[PDB]
Amino acid sequence: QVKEQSILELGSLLAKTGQAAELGGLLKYVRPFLNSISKAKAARLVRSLLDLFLDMEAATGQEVELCLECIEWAKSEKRTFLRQALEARLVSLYFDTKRYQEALHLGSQLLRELKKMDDKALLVEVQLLESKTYHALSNLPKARAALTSARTTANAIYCPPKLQATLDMQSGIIHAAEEKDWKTAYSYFYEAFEGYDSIDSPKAITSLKYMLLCKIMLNTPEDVQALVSGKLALRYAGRQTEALKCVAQASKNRSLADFEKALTDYRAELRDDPIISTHLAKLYDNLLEQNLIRVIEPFSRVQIEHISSLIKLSKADVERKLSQMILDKKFHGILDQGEGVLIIFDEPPVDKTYEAALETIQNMSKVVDSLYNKAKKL
Amino acid sequence: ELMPGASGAEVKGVCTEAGMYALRERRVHVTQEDFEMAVAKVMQKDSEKNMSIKKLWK
Amino acid sequence: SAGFDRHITIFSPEGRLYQVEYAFKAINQGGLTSVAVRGKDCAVIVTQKKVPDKLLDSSTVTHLFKITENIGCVMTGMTADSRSQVQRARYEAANWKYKYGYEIPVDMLCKRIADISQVYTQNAEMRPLGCCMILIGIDEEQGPQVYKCDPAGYYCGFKATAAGVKQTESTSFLEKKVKKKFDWTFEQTVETAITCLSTVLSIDFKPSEIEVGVVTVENPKFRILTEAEIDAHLVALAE
Amino acid sequence: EVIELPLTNPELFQRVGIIPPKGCLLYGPPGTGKTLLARAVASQLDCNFLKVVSSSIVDKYIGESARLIREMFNYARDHQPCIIFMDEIDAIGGEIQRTLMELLNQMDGFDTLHRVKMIMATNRPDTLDPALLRP
Amino acid sequence: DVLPPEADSSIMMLTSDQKPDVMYADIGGMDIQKQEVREAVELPLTHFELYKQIGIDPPRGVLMYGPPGCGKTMLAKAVAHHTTAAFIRVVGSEFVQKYLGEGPRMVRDVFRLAKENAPAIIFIDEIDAIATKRFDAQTGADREVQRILLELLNQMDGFDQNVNVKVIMATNRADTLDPALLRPGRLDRKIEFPLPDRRQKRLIFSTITSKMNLSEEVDLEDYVARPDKISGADINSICQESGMLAVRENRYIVLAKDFEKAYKTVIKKDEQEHEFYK
Amino acid sequence: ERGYSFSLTTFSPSGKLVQIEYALAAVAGGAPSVGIKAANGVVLATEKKQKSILYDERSVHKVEPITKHIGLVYSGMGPDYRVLVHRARKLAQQYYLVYQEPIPTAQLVQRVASVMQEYTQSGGVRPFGVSLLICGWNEGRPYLFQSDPSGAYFAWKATAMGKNYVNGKTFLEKRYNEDLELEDAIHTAILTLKESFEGQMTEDNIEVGICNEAGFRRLTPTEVKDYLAAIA
Amino acid sequence: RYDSRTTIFSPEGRLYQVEYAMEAIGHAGTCLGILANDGVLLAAERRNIHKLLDEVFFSEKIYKLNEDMACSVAGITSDANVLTNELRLIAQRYLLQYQEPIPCEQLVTALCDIKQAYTQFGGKRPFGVSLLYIGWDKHYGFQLYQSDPSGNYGGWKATCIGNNSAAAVSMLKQDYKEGEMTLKSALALAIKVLNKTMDVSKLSAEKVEIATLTRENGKTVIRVLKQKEVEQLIKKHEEEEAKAEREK
Numbered sequence A: 001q002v003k004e005q006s007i008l009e010l011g012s013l014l015a016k017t018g019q020a021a022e023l024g025g026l027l028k029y030v031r032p033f034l035n036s037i038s039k040a041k042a043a044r045l046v047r048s049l050l051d052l053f054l055d056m057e058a059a060t061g062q063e064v065e066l067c068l069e070c071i072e073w074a075k076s077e078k079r080t081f082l083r084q085a086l087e088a089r090l091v092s093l094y095f096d097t098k099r100y101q102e103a104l105h106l107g108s109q110l111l112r113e114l115k116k117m118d119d120k121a122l123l124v125e126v127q128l129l130e131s132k133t134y135h136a137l138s139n140l141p142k143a144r145a146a147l148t149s150a151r152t153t154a155n156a157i158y159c160p161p162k163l164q165a166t167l168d169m170q171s172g173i174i175h176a177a178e179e180k181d182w183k184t185a186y187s188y189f190y191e192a193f194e195g196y197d198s199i200d201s202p203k204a205i206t207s208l209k210y211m212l213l214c215k216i217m218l219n220t221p222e223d224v225q226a227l228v229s230g231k232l233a234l235r236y237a238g239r240q241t242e243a244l245k246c247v248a249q250a251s252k253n254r255s256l257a258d259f260e261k262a263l264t265d266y267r268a269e270l271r272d273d274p275i276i277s278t279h280l281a282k283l284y285d286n287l288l289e290q291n292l293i294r295v296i297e298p299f300s301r302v303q304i305e306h307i308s309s310l311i312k313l314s315k316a317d318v319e320r321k322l323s324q325m326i327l328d329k330k331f332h333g334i335l336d337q338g339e340g341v342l343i344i345f346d347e348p349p350v351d352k353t354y355e356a357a358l359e360t361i362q363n364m365s366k367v368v369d370s371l372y373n374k375a376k377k378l
Numbered sequence B: 001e002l003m004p005g006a007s008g009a010e011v012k013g014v015c016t017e018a019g020m021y022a023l024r025e026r027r028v029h030v031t032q033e034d035f036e037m038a039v040a041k042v043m044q045k046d047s048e049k050n051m052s053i054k055k056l057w058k
Numbered sequence C: 001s002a003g004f005d006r007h008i009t010i011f012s013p014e015g016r017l018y019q020v021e022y023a024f025k026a027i028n029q030g031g032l033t034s035v036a037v038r039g040k041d042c043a044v045i046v047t048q049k050k051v052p053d054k055l056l057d058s059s060t061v062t063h064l065f066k067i068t069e070n071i072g073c074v075m076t077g078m079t080a081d082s083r084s085q086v087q088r089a090r091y092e093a094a095n096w097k098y099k100y101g102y103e104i105p106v107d108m109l110c111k112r113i114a115d116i117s118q119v120y121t122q123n124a125e126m127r128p129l130g131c132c133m134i135l136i137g138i139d140e141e142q143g144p145q146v147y148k149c150d151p152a153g154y155y156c157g158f159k160a161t162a163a164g165v166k167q168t169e170s171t172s173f174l175e176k177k178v179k180k181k182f183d184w185t186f187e188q189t190v191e192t193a194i195t196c197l198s199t200v201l202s203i204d205f206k207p208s209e210i211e212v213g214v215v216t217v218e219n220p221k222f223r224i225l226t227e228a229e230i231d232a233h234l235v236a237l238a239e
Numbered sequence D: 001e002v003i004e005l006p007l008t009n010p011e012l013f014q015r016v017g018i019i020p021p022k023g024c025l026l027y028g029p030p031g032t033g034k035t036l037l038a039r040a041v042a043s044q045l046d047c048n049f050l051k052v053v054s055s056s057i058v059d060k061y062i063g064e065s066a067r068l069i070r071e072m073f074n075y076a077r078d079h080q081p082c083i084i085f086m087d088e089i090d091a092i093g094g095e096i097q098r099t100l101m102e103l104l105n106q107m108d109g110f111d112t113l114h115r116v117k118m119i120m121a122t123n124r125p126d127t128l129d130p131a132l133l134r135p
Numbered sequence E: 001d002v003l004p005p006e007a008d009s010s011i012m013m014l015t016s017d018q019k020p021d022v023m024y025a026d027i028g029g030m031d032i033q034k035q036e037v038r039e040a041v042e043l044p045l046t047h048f049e050l051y052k053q054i055g056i057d058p059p060r061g062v063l064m065y066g067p068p069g070c071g072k073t074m075l076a077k078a079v080a081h082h083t084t085a086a087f088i089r090v091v092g093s094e095f096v097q098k099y100l101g102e103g104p105r106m107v108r109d110v111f112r113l114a115k116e117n118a119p120a121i122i123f124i125d126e127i128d129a130i131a132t133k134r135f136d137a138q139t140g141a142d143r144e145v146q147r148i149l150l151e152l153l154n155q156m157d158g159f160d161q162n163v164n165v166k167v168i169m170a171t172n173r174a175d176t177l178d179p180a181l182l183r184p185g186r187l188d189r190k191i192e193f194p195l196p197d198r199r200q201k202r203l204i205f206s207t208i209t210s211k212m213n214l215s216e217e218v219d220l221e222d223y224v225a226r227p228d229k230i231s232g233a234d235i236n237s238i239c240q241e242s243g244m245l246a247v248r249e250n251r252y253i254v255l256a257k258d259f260e261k262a263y264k265t266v267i268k269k270d271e272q273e274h275e276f277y278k
Numbered sequence F: 001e002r003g004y005s006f007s008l009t010t011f012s013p014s015g016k017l018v019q020i021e022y023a024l025a026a027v028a029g030g031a032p033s034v035g036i037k038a039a040n041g042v043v044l045a046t047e048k049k050q051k052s053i054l055y056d057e058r059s060v061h062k063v064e065p066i067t068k069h070i071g072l073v074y075s076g077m078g079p080d081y082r083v084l085v086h087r088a089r090k091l092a093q094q095y096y097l098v099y100q101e102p103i104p105t106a107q108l109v110q111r112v113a114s115v116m117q118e119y120t121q122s123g124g125v126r127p128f129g130v131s132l133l134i135c136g137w138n139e140g141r142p143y144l145f146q147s148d149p150s151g152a153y154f155a156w157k158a159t160a161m162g163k164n165y166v167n168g169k170t171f172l173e174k175r176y177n178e179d180l181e182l183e184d185a186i187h188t189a190i191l192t193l194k195e196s197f198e199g200q201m202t203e204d205n206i207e208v209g210i211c212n213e214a215g216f217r218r219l220t221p222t223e224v225k226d227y228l229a230a231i232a
Numbered sequence G: 001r002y003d004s005r006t007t008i009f010s011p012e013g014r015l016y017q018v019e020y021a022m023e024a025i026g027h028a029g030t031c032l033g034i035l036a037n038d039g040v041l042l043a044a045e046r047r048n049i050h051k052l053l054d055e056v057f058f059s060e061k062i063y064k065l066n067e068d069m070a071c072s073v074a075g076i077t078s079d080a081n082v083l084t085n086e087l088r089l090i091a092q093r094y095l096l097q098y099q100e101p102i103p104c105e106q107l108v109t110a111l112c113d114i115k116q117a118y119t120q121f122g123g124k125r126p127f128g129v130s131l132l133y134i135g136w137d138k139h140y141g142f143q144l145y146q147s148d149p150s151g152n153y154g155g156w157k158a159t160c161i162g163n164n165s166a167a168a169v170s171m172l173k174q175d176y177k178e179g180e181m182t183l184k185s186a187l188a189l190a191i192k193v194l195n196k197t198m199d200v201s202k203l204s205a206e207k208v209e210i211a212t213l214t215r216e217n218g219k220t221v222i223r224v225l226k227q228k229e230v231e232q233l234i235k236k237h238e239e240e241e242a243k244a245e246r247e248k
């Protein structure tokens, strides 16, 4: 009782001071003390100590080794519950360390036992982690399946506010990744934001960010500002909020210059987030396509320089984008690089008569083969 | 075994629901876990849900 | 559905006792309305006094009954059933005083009347009395107390309540009233009661068309205001 | 206040962005002037008040299902501009359950381009059910 | 000569001008139910090659069960608007008629009309009236209603396989209804339409108020976060009543005070309650 | 079989006493109430939501004491609740007079169930349209029972009756553990009522009583407010 | 119709309310009784087995009436409770009057007489409870008795009532050896017949309660088997089934 509290407070202070080797040595030294105490209490303490050790930025590479040695200690002492706790946190650490393949392997090798065991909260957490690493691996259908399994298991137990907030976060992220319906992604992100706010967790701000991002993807950027001036959003107002505000303003004004300026300014909050970066790049590409089509209706043989001046980008970027649209069977036209022009025409239909004539020629080629099958009877 | 006394049309529904899970996962094969959970969905039983009523008959 | 509404002991398939609801509807058959307001240190009841005949002795038309020197009641519904419940309540109060020495609280008066009503509801022997009773009394250590008793046997205390035809409207007006915090003086309590009745009836309220019973902490005796006092209260209300 | 806005200024509903209110119940004792009030306001706007006399407008009547619906719709609103009423003023307001479901299907929600405004004046308050109290 | 087939509205036969004009966008937050209904009655009529590839005989009958005013009929309307088949709408009250043998005759006429205009979708609306459990009948009315149910069962999955038609049903309870109707062969899918929660309610509010004028100070969240269990019909009623309250006070912009008043008005659902049932 | 839904002394051809089931339906249409037993005691909570501010919240208390160590809440008709409370108190006093020891919870539940049964064995009398959740503490062990209009009594570990009782039971089996404590019990019961409570839980809208070793005590509104603040 | 009142004879002389109670007995949980040399046992299914139901009586279907008597129960809960309390009262009245335990059969008849009253006098619904009786006395030793809602009773060596009663009685007819049956064989037979009659597989022990009656040094001990011995009985049944599988 006194010893446990002293160990936990010493670990907290040490993590504040950041001596990874000392914390690891303390964890090894308190191993005999774990047998002298109860099971659930020892699991709680080991989980707290490992969390304090892992949370700090001391990326010395001994984190995975410490987790593996804790797992081997648990296997030696046959403490299955704490063992699965270590595996779950190891999967989380692997996901956060961009070591997705081993995270996938550990999750796959653990999910069987966690399905056998009735601790469905850990199973929900591991299923969410599997969905997260699948989405990070671009395997969207598998991530969606894992998320659906996580939700099915979640609607059978009491989900704490943190677990429900994580569930809503991942559901909104998955819905956003499948760019077919953004209203439900926004709703799930708002639910995750409320759940995270109820516990004052940091990730709440991320939720807010995604909600604003969602409000941009239904080409309604104004509400983003209306979302920032909301009772729960004043507390989280900051550099990221103004970043999304100016991005929404650029989208509202249909200005790619403003969009690129906003991206360059808040490069830390618009490129370091994979979801935000991907969706904003997609939105910028669509806006570029729309404006290129808009300024191409009047002309017939306009130069690339004039279009670049109209839309305010580089000539090379405009030329590459135009070539991409032409190649992808978008707006019809051909670029003349020799003088610098993009001609436009009216794409003559196909002359259905000739296509049907070709089909008939093939059909009576078949008929002639059939007659060749005949006429063998002299 | 997992279908203790079905109707026979419930078996066809079980196969159809396993195929539906395969379709929703965009695959063409069917797995054993898929079949078992399709059985669970098709075998949905509605109990009294009122222990007061169930405890009338001791 | 409505084929289960001929015996008070028969539960409808939805679990509803329709005969009790029919007694509740019969509450409004009297055609009058009564409003009770509990002030900071007083309780007041005002009831419609409809004498549609110059031949009636206006003294005996009263719907206000003194159950006990400190506990007063106002009745709504059929007059015969209301008077029967009044005598039953008076007998219960006398029995309580005789068997326990001290005066019965209004709490227990309504509780016992509601128990009798419930017994009539569960045993299909007597038709439930379709009369609503409102009791006012100065209960020591609790100040004024206003209680309502229904044919169903559900007794409840009220800061302010009403019964009769215009029950929903009067209750809504009171709900609008008791919400804005105010000094609930005795004059203020009478003012609230009379304003409720007038607003729900849209009647100029000549002093002979209403009856007011009053109990106060200063004098914990059930007092029925004379017509002169009713006129004084009305003229104070108008200005 | 209930009817003149749908007649005089239907555009204010678009200004706020809401479907016009259809079901307005002028419930009260018969013979007190309900249809008189309706005719008075109709003459105030000179709009053809087509009070329903069942025939060519019966809908809920279970003898025929969809032909009666067709008569209800086409005879009024389309041919005759607007302003409707109903007979048996307390009949449908109060197989009876199925009759109520069919009434709800008849009245639930129709296109506002064509007006089937159901200004009912049922004679009693107890002849109502919560299934109609929805706006 | 042979005249062109004069197939017309007949019973309902929703024409291209009679579409309900309700889209999936008009529906706020019914993701699971939308997905199930689209897999059942929209995907087979367009992407049948996937069903052939798996070889699973896509379902023919679905039933939406849940509290009233939760969007079953509107989802049927949305399916009608976004379908390439011949939609048929009918409630389980038009079948019950006098002149015994017209109910089953109507059922078989509707199913034959759907077969003729294949592909077709039959949305059987509120069905608690005629789908009830076939308990031992002893009267003419009971015999006829059980006859109607039997004709429905025979037409939905009988000796004559219809093929290329779909059946959609609505119910409030789903604890009732004959197990023959709930057979996987007849009603393969049973979707539940529960009361909207804090998530679905937010989507419903955003969808309904996306057309209204509203105002800056109107924060729908203050009404979403309320723990009251209200349905999509309740959300729509609240919005319409708030708009009418704003209009009555001669205001073209809906304020928060009218929203609060309308929410308080709609929330009140005790009425009398007689205060002893509670 | 509607012809057998009127008589309380007539078996249906399927052998069901329909009127008792109708009384149980009336019970299920009552105000939500929850009762959960933890290793430290029992907790009974109920929704005392009035139709308006006019109703005096403190006038009538839904959670009532039977003995010093026995409490009892209800779901269903209100007036029948008072009759059952009076009969339970009288039975407890009779047992105390006979045996000089406070009545065991199981014995009181049995006698109250018999009393409720007495109203289901004759025509012209209506079954008690209320279900009772009774808490008691004897022999260093909590006891929670549910008595029904049918006279059937069980030994619920954790349950909910009244409106949305299915929702309360579904919320249970999730937030309920047999090794909880009285404080955790109070929190879980308040949450379970929140799953079926429409509006803000004002301290006067919820009545909670605790059956612990010291006896049965109904929580004062101050403690209810403190627990609600700790929960919300 | 002639089923509105318990005292109305049908034109064919059938009391329809009594037959309705008898058929309603089928709704009650399966309870079975087997007699054997030096023993007699009851078994019953717990039916409602929800995880939130605390099991504090341990004998929700088995009751101890006298020192050397026990009864099962299958019927309405309230009728079962009053019938068991009145059985105990009759047994104790007999013991007080004669200073000798009531010889089983008489007790049955006593209760049965009372049930007959509810099928004869008007205004009273017939007791919709049928119950088994096991006991021992100085006259006929171990005895097993079957009762009906009509108040008719009968001696038996192996019989069951409640859910799937016909299947249980057929199985007992097939697998009972008169004269050469012991307590262990009776317990095994009860376990197997409960497994077959209960649609649930593997016959989980906490869903079944077994109470035995045996004479031990003139003390007629009545035991209710705890869960632990039912675990090993279920394991024994499973291993016999596995051994019988060897034929394939």
Ligand SMILES: Nc1ncnc2c1ncn2[C@@H]1O[C@H](COP(=O)(O)OP(=O)(O)O)[C@@H](O)[C@H]1O
Pocket (backbone or CB within 6 Å): D030, D031, D032, D033, D034, D035, D036, D089, D121
């Ligand atoms: N305010 C009024 N002024 C003049 N006459 C009236 C008034 N109200 C009712 N009436 C008379 O009473 C009758 C009202 O009938 P009405 O209310 O239209 O019955 P219903 O509404 O059932 O058709 C008419 O004949 C009319 O002459």
Ligand SMILES: Nc1ncnc2c1ncn2[C@@H]1O[C@H](COP(=O)(O)OP(=O)(O)O)[C@@H](O)[C@H]1O
Pocket (backbone or CB within 6 Å): E026, E027, E028, E029, E030, E067, E068, E069, E070, E071, E072, E073, E074, E075, E170, E203, E204, E207, E208, E231, E232, E233, E234, E236
């Ligand atoms: N998710 C939703 N989004 C928007 N509106 C809804 C939603 N759910 C219900 N509503 C509103 O509620 C009404 C429900 O009507 P209906 O579909 O007939 O209910 P039910 O089918 O449950 O009886 C619709 O008119 C619609 O305007």
Ligand SMILES: [Mg+2]
Pocket (backbone or CB within 6 Å): E069, E072, E073, E074
């Ligand atoms: Mg509908």
